[PDB]
Design a protein around this ligand. Structure first.
Ligand SMILES: C[C@H]1CCC[C@H](C[C@H]2Cc3cc(O)cc(O)c3C(=O)O2)O1
Ligand SMILES: C[C@H]1CCC[C@H](C[C@H]2Cc3cc(O)cc(O)c3C(=O)O2)O1
Ligand SMILES: N[C@@H](CCCC[NH3+])C(=O)O
Ligand SMILES: N[C@@H](CCCC[NH3+])C(=O)O
Lengths: 9, 501, 501, 9
């Protein structure tokens, strides 16, 4: 599982 | 007679507009759609007439059946659903106007209807018109028995009018695309748009479309993939990107192929092909589950009259190693993966191919022999979604070399129903090695294969500013659509497919 | 010197490869994003070092500053934010590794960092590395300083790395597109894909791109608009459709124009241009408010050095009728709108154009004179979003005739900052009249210049099965992006814009 | 205001 990045929208 | 019907109807409508009765009105105000009209008034009992409720609806007449005289029935269709218009002379605004409008209308006509909700003694939900307005006439005789594919594809409006399952198919396609967009958006991807006209085509293997630009005296190519631009954007510091868009490959037209088709490519920094394998698993399984309500989908490869298979999208997907299991299926030992560019290895693959009766038309190369061999012994065993992994370097010029495996790369393909819906790999971020592989491709282009990749110096230059470890991914949208719509022909999931004269 | 730098660094990295220290590793596991790190640990007091917490992060080095014996500071950037890496040999794995890895690293390099959350005596949030890994080197010397626009546009990755506002611009663009999608989807529209390669180009007035299809052995045109296909799909019984896609018009490149640009077209059954005016108001105002926080947005037409105007997107938008307010702006009464196609009125407009000093290069025709006069006296009047309505039929071959006004059509254009972001009209559903107009302009094409549209027989044939009363709409996505990003150049809102050297 | 049609999604 890849690290979490906040959605642009 | 359909021709004569066209003539007559044309004349009728013509003198209608000559007489100023306006067969093509500008605006009709629709109070409620047919669907929630059905939802709202379905509870009515047979014989009910609600006189104090007046609604305006609109649609196309699919059938016209007279009970004779004072009563006439219209089949009003739209939104993939049905509503009966029961026109009774006594319930109309007046008998005269009833007569007049009824003699005017034909099957196929677009009409608005102002009337009361109700239900017939037969139990059919109906609307009883105060007035019927012709919104626009159909000048052609509408078909009776469109079961033939070519006519359906060339005129898509007829197919959509007569066939609901078509509408459902394209709805499914839209659902797929939007689902992918949501999935990637929520993972922090940025939806991007890259040039569809490039100086040098790249990112894939195919024959390009060529066009001319009327500003710059130069010729330009239509893109065969979005790969290089995306990776350049990852170099730019945008860590997660994706594009669902049109891609052009000029090639044969068949069941799985169209010259222009929609693909989705995403690129994820700090990810490798394993990560992308699991992300692919949950994306595909989740898509199938959300849309079809289940992980398992019935599919007919040969069509409705042929045998159906059950495709199980339940994760995790089966993983297979190309060379390894190819050795398993051949019952023979293949040369070590470091030796694959050797002409000796090419001869070995040749003898194996001729021994297994696997045809490989000229030019006969290690890569083509291997591709046909894999296609024969491996791809055919993929019914459920299946990963074919660790392709040799020769088959994957843009893929990063395998970390533990000499001569191979880190790459996978996702196969459903023996067809490839996905191509993804750990991206090669080494500029020197990339430029070298591009050199090999260039030499092979100037002698051998003509769809072979051209060296892109801008992209290598971009790699020289450095590319973080990154995994790329791509998916044919149309094929996924085929599999979720139960279609064996790509033309089914394309609104206006390319057709031969 | 930067060239010498490139050579030296290239040699060094290559020798790192020869020595087998792997300057381009396959996989680094990132535990947490820089953003999440920043906001999670921002609560730390200066001097804090958390030895219990070990995290892995990654990014690009924008600065390297040394206290110079045992202490080196890295400015680590990514995700539009920054994090300090404070590396002292005391906290490193060992002093030797510290020395080695620090001698290896340069500015611009992509690195992973394993270490602990902390804050310097100066109060800067930092991560104190247990180990630093080079994920990928930067072989080029980065600008100190990338102001020149040509360099920014030709290498976009450099612009994205060095300039933080670019990312925000394209984020805003993405937000616009996604917002439009959400809007139309929620209004019950179906997102569709129509051919980008056509036999006959249509839907607008532009000079087309021409390409060749191999298997079909014929020339095809790149689409200048999606209009006709959409209307044909409305005929098919799909009442509400929309497409956000690439459109190709081969023409001059300037601040407001690019050969390929993204447009959004939707078509709505049983609607007219009034309804679409209201919908446009709500969509645009809602978009601007949602993205920018309010209805008012500041825009610099001449750039940051020039004056800024306040654009008020507060609904309703101001409406003006073309002919009427042109008469009021000229201080002259124009001819009656039903006379607009006679040579006489054209001569009158010639006289008015020469009297008002409005230039119209040959050919001088009524349509182009009207366009120049409206452009001069009207389009400049629009700062806030403004509807210009009821265009003459001569300027609108695809628009339905105005119901109350003879010679005009039901049509509107939406203007923001003197520029046209939107074009919409009540669709002409009459096949005979449509084919007639088409044939007039085809007769112009035969009258000896190519501007005028080609006749589409398939589209008229589709209209003969009837088209429900329908309104239709289109929007330049790039221009809207320009106005919401405060850009006076379209190249700013395009990732890899077309360039003329 | 146009009549409401349920989202395909
Ligand atoms: C971009 C790629 C990634 C792998 C799956 C899929 C392969 C692609 C091959 C391909 C080639 C072609 O010439 C025409 C087509 O319609 C397709 C296709 O639909 O699927 O999309
Ligand atoms: C599709 C239309 C609707 C009206 C506004 C806008 C006009 C369109 C014209 C146009 C022509 C062209 O050759 C290149 C371009 O970038 C544009 C554009 O951005 O805007 O979009
Ligand atoms: N450009 C590829 C899709 C992406 C593969 C991974 N970089 C085709 O097929
Ligand atoms: N095809 C148009 C956009 C839609 C106009 C209304 N049908 C251009 O401009």
């Amino acid at each position: 599982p890849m690290y979490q990045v906040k959605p642009y929208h | 007679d359909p021709n004569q019907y066209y003539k007559i109807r044309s004349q009728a409508i013509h003198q209608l507009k000559v007489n100023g009765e306006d067969p093509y009105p500008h605006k009709f105000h629709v109070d409620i759609s047919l669907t929630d009209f059905i939802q709202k008034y379905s509870h009515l009992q047979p014989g009910d007439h609600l006189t104090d409720i007046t609604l305006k609806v609109a649609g196309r007449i699919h059938a016209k059946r007279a009970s004779g005289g004072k009563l006439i029935f219209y089949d009003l269709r739209g939104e993939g659903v049905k509503l009966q218009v029961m026109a009774n002379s006594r319930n109309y605004k007046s008998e005269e106007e009833f007569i007049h409008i009824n003699n005017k209308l034909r099957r196929g006509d677009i009409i608005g209807v102002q009337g009361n909700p109700g239900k017939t003694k037969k139990g059919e939900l109906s609307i009883i018109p105060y007035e019927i307005t012709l919104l626009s006439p159909c000048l052609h005789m509408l078909p009776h028995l469109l079961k033939d594919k070519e006519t359906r594809y060339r005129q898509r409006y007829l197919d959509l009018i007569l066939n609901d399952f078509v509408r459902q198919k394209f709805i499914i396609r839209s659902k797929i695309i939007t689902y992918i967009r949501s999935f990637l958006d929520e993972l922090g991807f940025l939806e991007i748009e890259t040039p569809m006209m490039n100086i040098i085509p790249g990112g894939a293997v195919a024959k390009p479309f060529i066009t001319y630009h009327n500003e710059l005296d130069m010729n330009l190519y239509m893109r065969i993939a979005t790969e290089l631009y995306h990776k350049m954007l990852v170099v730019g510091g945008i860590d997660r990107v994706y594009e669902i868009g049109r891609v052009f490959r000029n090639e044969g037209i068949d069941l799985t192929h169209n010259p222009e088709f929609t693909s989705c490519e995403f690129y994820m920094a700090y990810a490798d092909y394993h990560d992308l394998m699991e992300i692919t698993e949950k994306m595909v399984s989740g898509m199938v589950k959300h849309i079809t309500g289940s992980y398992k989908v019935t599919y007919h490869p040969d069509g409705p009259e042929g045998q159906a298979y059950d495709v199980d999208f339940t994760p995790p997907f089966r993983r297979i190693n190309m060379v390894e299991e190819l050795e398993k299926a051949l019952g023979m030992k293949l040369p070590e993966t470091n030796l694959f560019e050797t002409e000796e290895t090419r001869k070995i693959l040749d003898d194996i191919c001729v021994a297994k009766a696997v045809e490989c038309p000229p030019p006969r190369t290690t890569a083509r022999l291997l591709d046909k061999l894999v296609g024969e012994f491996l791809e055919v065993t993929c019914i459920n979604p299946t990963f074919i992994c660790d392709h040799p370097q020769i088959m994957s010029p843009l893929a990063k070399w395998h970390r533990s495996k000499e001569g191979l790369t880190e790459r996978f393909e996702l196969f459903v129903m023996k067809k490839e819906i996905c191509n993804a790999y750990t991206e090669l971020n080494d500029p020197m090695r990339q430029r070298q592989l591009f050199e090999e491709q260039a030499k092979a282009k100037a002698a051998g294969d003509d769809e072979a990749m051209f060296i892109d110096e801008n992209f290598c230059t971009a790699l020289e500013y450095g590319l973080p470890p990154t995994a790329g991914w791509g998916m044919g949208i149309d094929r996924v659509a085929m599999f979720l719509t139960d279609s064996n022909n790509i033309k089914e999931v394309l609104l206006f497919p390319a057709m031969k004269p």
